[PDB]
Amino acid sequence: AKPQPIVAANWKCNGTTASIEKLVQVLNEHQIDHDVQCVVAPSFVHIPMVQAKLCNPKYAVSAENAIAKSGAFTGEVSMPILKDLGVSWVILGHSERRTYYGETDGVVAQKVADAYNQGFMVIACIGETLQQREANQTAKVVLSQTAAIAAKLPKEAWSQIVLAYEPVWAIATPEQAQEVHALLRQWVSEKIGNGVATKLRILYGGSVTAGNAKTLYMKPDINGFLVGGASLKPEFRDIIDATR
Amino acid sequence: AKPQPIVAANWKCNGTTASIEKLVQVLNEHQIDHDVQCVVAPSFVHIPMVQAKLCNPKYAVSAENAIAKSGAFTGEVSMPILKDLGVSWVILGHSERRTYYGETDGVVAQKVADAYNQGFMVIACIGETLQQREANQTAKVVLSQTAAIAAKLPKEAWSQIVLAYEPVWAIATPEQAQEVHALLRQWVSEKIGNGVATKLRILYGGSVTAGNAKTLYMKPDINGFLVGGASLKPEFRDIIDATR
Ligand SMILES: [As]
Ligand SMILES: [As]
Numbered sequence A, B: 001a002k003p004q005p006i007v008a009a010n011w012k013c014n015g016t017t018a019s020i021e022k023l024v025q026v027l028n029e030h031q032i033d034h035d036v037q038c039v040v041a042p043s044f045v046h047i048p049m050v051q052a053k054l055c056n057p058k059y060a061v062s063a064e065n066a067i068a069k070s071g072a073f074t075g076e077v078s079m080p081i082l083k084d085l086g087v088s089w090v091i092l093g094h095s096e097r098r099t100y101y102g103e104t105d106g107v108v109a110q111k112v113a114d115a116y117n118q119g120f121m122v123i124a125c126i127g128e129t130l131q132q133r134e135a136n137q138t139a140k141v142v143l144s145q146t147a148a149i150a151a152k153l154p155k156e157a158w159s160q161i162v163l164a165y166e167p168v169w170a171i172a173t174p175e176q177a178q179e180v181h182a183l184l185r186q187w188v189s190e191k192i193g194n195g196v197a198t199k200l201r202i203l204y205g206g207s208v209t210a211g212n213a214k215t216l217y218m219k220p221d222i223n224g225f226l227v228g229g230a231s232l233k234p235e236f237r238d239i240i241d242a243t244r
Helices: A017-029 A046-055 A079-085 A097-099 A103-117 A128-136 A138-150 A155-160 A173-192 A194-199 A212-217 A236-241 B018-029 B044-053 B079-085 B095-100 B105-117 B130-134 B140-148 B155-160 B173-189 B194-199 B213-217 B236-241
Strands: A004-010 A038-039 A057-064 A088-094 A121-128 A161-165 A202-204 A224-227 B008-012 B037-041 B061-062 B088-090 B122-125 B161-165 B202-204 B224-227
Touching: A004 B061, A017 A046, A046 B044, A079 B044, A088 A103, A088 A224, A088 B037, A097 A224, A097 B088, A103 A121, A103 A138, A103 B037, A121 A138, A121 B088, A128 A138, A128 B194, A138 A161, A138 A173, A155 A161, A155 A194, A155 A202, A161 A173, A173 A194, A173 A202, A173 A212, A202 B202, A202 B224, A212 A224, B008 B236, B018 B044, B018 B061, B018 B161, B018 B236, B037 B088, B044 B061, B044 B079, B061 B202, B061 B224, B088 B105, B105 B122, B105 B155, B130 B140, B140 B161, B155 B161, B155 B194, B161 B173, B173 B194
Parallel strands: A004 A038, A004 A224, A038 A057, A057 A088, A088 A121, A121 A161, A161 A202, A202 A224, B008 B037, B008 B224, B037 B061, B061 B088, B088 B122, B122 B161, B161 B202, B202 B224
Antiparallel strands: none
């Protein structure tokens, strides 16, 4: 029933040359025996070393953010630059960028559309804060965020979209995760179409560990993970193996 | 009289693998016959290729921005990451980040202090908008920006600081540039000390071309350049040679 799972590592703003060499060697030696798309998103300056040292073809390298256009945007990295470098995945709308770096719903929606139209696979992040959840606004918020993205996309774009639900309010039980994933998928099914909804990967982006990954993946509407801190450790392999 | 000049290339969010290979080969073949510190600031994902292909020891590689701390800051690059990668220069406070990416005077001042305390050479950018210049507030603005930076630095930090004046209102005659540079240096001399003021490099960050570089460098308070678009072209070499 489920579509191909994805296990994505978000290294955030972490790593050294030495630590990444060691971690990538562990990922390269891991023999994955089922159909899963693995993604690694290093900090921008580590993308080249990861591209060079990774040899496991079940992985793609992602950026952790991008802007749409090259030009006079000191400090930023654009989608054309990433494409020329051979990066075809990007994480957009991460809660830390929505919170700290001014990415409103509209800003994220436009970036996702720009990444779609430039050929990227996009992990688009959504999720509600503690104040929003306490106000009983979980559904209003995650469906407003998703709707904003959807309004700028044609139906055919959804083959390049992956959603990641971040329970910002926690950063949650597997049951609470499943409730939001099911709501997201039912809204896509109604508004966009049931074929899009059954093929869409909705990844869980709360706290994922070797301890809890299999329990989360048992949920019918969870299609893998956007992993934070545990993705810097050898137990990331156990999180991949939890999607069998 | 003048301190060692600096000619810094800010590539902004521009370049391809192919274009950078070609440009770096031109910079590597250029024989520089006087004492000048050259800097190249590529987009983050191009830092490694530039570090590898550059062979001209008169150049240092810079970042175009950074944050102070590693951690859960998706999409950002930190000063410890850059140091581990061997980057010891950073541009902070560029007008495009102050304008588009929420860097207030306080935010820039704190980053400069954090980069000082982590051992970086810092090109700290200041400059007034068209509305501020029309209000006759050039001096209020560039000295407020500089004062905000200075308030977080001990006197000994100034060996690691370089100022870059950006005439945002234009982006200017060499005379207008010299007036602001002279004002900046006189304020540093009074507030911080005359030995700091005579050793400080104040770089001009308006439109610098092969056509105008020597005329600008003739000005007594201009110590080189933070160059935009012309730094992507072979005529960057002519801008370096204008600091003889
Ligand atoms: As291999
Ligand atoms: As050489």
